[PDB]
Amino acid sequence: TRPRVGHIQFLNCLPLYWGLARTGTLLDFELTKDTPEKLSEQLVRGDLDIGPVTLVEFLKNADDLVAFPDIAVGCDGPVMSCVIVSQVPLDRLDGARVALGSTSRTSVRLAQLLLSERFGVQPDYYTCPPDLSLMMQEADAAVLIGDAALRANMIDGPRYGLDVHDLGALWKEWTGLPFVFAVWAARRDYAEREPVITRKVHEAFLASRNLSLEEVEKVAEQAARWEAFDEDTLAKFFTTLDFRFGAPQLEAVTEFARRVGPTTGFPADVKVELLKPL
Amino acid sequence: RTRPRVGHIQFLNCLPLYWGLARTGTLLDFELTKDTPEKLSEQLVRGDLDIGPVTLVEFLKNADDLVAFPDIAVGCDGPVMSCVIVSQVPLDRLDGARVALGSTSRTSVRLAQLLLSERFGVQPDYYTCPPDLSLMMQEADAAVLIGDAALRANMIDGPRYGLDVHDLGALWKEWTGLPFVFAVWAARRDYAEREPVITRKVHEAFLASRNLSLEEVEKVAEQAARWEAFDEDTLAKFFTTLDFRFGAPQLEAVTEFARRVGPTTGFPADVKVELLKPLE
Numbered sequence: 001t002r003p004r005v006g007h008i009q010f011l012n013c014l015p016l017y018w019g020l021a022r023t024g025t026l027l028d029f030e031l032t033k034d035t036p037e038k039l040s041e042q043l044v045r046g047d048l049d050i051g052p053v054t055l056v057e058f059l060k061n062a063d064d065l066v067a068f069p070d071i072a073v074g075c076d077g078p079v080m081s082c083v084i085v086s087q088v089p090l091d092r093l094d095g096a097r098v099a100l101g102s103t104s105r106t107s108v109r110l111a112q113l114l115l116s117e118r119f120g121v122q123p124d125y126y127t128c129p130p131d132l133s134l135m136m137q138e139a140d141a142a143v144l145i146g147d148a149a150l151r152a153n154m155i156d157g158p159r160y161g162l163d164v165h166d167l168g169a170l171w172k173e174w175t176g177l178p179f180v181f182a183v184w185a186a187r188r189d190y191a192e193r194e195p196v197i198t199r200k201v202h203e204a205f206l207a208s209r210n211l212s213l214e215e216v217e218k219v220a221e222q223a224a225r226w227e228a229f230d231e232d233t234l235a236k237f238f239t240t241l242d243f244r245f246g247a248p249q250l251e252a253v254t255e256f257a258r259r260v261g262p263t264t265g266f267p268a269d270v271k272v273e274l275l276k277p278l
Numbered sequence: 279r280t281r282p283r284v285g286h287i288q289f290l291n292c293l294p295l296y297w298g299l300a301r302t303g304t305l306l307d308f309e310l311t312k313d314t315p316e317k318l319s320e321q322l323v324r325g326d327l328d329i330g331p332v333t334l335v336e337f338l339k340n341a342d343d344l345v346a347f348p349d350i351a352v353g354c355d356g357p358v359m360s361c362v363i364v365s366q367v368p369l370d371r372l373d374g375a376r377v378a379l380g381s382t383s384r385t386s387v388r389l390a391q392l393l394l395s396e397r398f399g400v401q402p403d404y405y406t407c408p409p410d411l412s413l414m415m416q417e418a419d420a421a422v423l424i425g426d427a428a429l430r431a432n433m434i435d436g437p438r439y440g441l442d443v444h445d446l447g448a449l450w451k452e453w454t455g456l457p458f459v460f461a462v463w464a465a466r467r468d469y470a471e472r473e474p475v476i477t478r479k480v481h482e483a484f485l486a487s488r489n490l491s492l493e494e495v496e497k498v499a500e501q502a503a504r505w506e507a508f509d510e511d512t513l514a515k516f517f518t519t520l521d522f523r524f525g526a527p528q529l530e531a532v533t534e535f536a537r538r539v540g541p542t543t544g545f546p547a548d549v550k551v552e553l554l555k556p557l558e
């Protein structure tokens with residue numbers, strides 16, 4: 001039977017979806033599209049065999065997952081789709097209410113780490129669906145990912161004079177490091193039961209990622225007919241995202257794990273098992 | 279501006295078309311929904327979809343509210359392989375017998391009833407149930423199946439358990455000498471009039487995807503053979519036996535079928551099939 005594969009419905013993986021379709025890879029998958037927190041729960045509990053895992057959930061389940069090398073959802077500098085929208089400066093958020101988008105697990109933890117250990121504020125956090133308008137009427141700041149964040153950063157922010165802090169840029173300023181928000185991984189039991197299929201799926205993901213980068217202009221032009229963003233914005237977003245996952249990216253994962261591990265539920269020296277090649 | 283909500287039959291008959299939609303990138307212009315043909319018909323008719331496949335009987339019941347796509351359909355000229363009657367006794371011995379009808383079907387089940395009533399002259403006790411040959415064959419004397427269940431019964435379960443499998447396309451061909459159309463592609467009338475361009479663009483993309491799927495049918499069969507119960511040769515045979523044309527000879531078959539079942543199925547015998555007009 002076809003491997004059950006997850007796919008983030010956000011725009012960040014729309015070019016990858018293009019690559020999976022153009023190559024015919026989709027027809028080897030039983031694909032499930034959803035938000036990253038749902039896809040992580042599904043893979044961890046066994047409703048999926050392979051799929052994207054938000055980094056915090058992967059590190060909490062590192063013993064049961066095998067990450068795919070050379071592909072991830074990340075950035076080196078700004079990421080555009082992970083932001084803090086605030087009505088006041090970040091240093092004035094201590095004791096204030098900050099809304100956390102329900103879809104996120106890694107970016108919200110990154111935002112909490114930055115606000116606590118870089119800016120030194122301790123706000124009262126709460127979780128709610130990602131809706132800027134609603135969040136801005138009930139809290140002083142909001143952490144968003146996905147299309148909601150890109151909409152807040154490129155449209156709603158400038159239109160209503162709200163500060164939009166790029167979480168990738170804040171992490172780059174703080175540490176000089178890139179960041180990895182999500183990785184691709186297979187369940188350990190599936191990887192050991194089907195080593196061949198796991199490798200073929202991994203190789204197909206790399207091939208689809210490679211083609212999407214070569215055809216990024218075609219992806220942006222097509223998506224521009226249906227999204228709120230124009231072709232230039234989408235092409236910039238697709239090219240600003242960093243889909244590599246090598247030594248410099250793993251270094252960023254290691255440092256992030258060290259800083260949040262003791263207060264998030266996984267060891268500071270947690271090990272990331274990578275899928276070995278034949 | 280939002281992507282058109284497009285249906286797609288999950289059966290193997292439209293797997294090559296899905297390959298074509300993916301390879302061309304057309305999928306990324308769609309909000310695609312995969313399901314069985316009876317659900318996809320309900321969804322489009324009630325407004326949950328904008329464009330999609332409609333089993334012919336349901337299309338004719340709603341012909342005033344739908345606009346059929348020319349030059350693409352799910353049909354056959356002779357055997358169709360995926361629409362069959364599986365019977366433990368000869369067809370002429372089914373009078374008063376139990377015949378199970380697969381819930382997934384609307385057109386083939388009506389075709390089977392038409393053939394059994396007006397060609398073979400039997401009047402069995404029909405009942406509808408989920409498509410499960412094992413269950414049907416232990417509980418009824420015959421069963422009408424479509425989709426992967428029918429193809430499995432025709433190519434695998436049938437010969438394995440010594441059961442007669444009558445191809446519904448072939449029976450219709452023997453009876454009338456005509457091809458048959460089981461499902462058509464159509465847009466909601468309100469959507470076609472609100473978005474004529476998108477409707478035409480979707481129609482043209484379906485034709486392009488259909489054309490490419492026929493050119494690369496070998497690659498489709500080879501890939502699908504890794505995951506399905508059927509081998510590559512069987513899949514390639516099925517994909518090439520299916521007839522995806524929808525022109526004058528196919529509409530002629532629809533007209534004749536509508537005339538024979540219309541008075542007893544819920545649409546006029548003289549029902550009109552509105553085709554999407556091309557730009558001048």
Ligand SMILES: C=C(Oc1cccc(C(=O)O)c1)C(=O)O
Pocket residue numbers: 008010012036037054055073074079081082103104105106107108145146147181182
């Ligand atoms: C690039 C992004 O960063 C992500 C992606 C997936 C999950 C998360 C998370 O916060 O769990 C963040 C984006 O949202 O587009």
Ligand SMILES: C=C(Oc1cccc(C(=O)O)c1)C(=O)O
Pocket residue numbers: 287289291315316333334352353358360361382383384385386387424425426460461
């Ligand atoms: C070729 C087939 O014929 C069909 C297709 C779709 C719907 C129906 C129906 O009976 O409603 C029949 C197949 O099932 O593969």
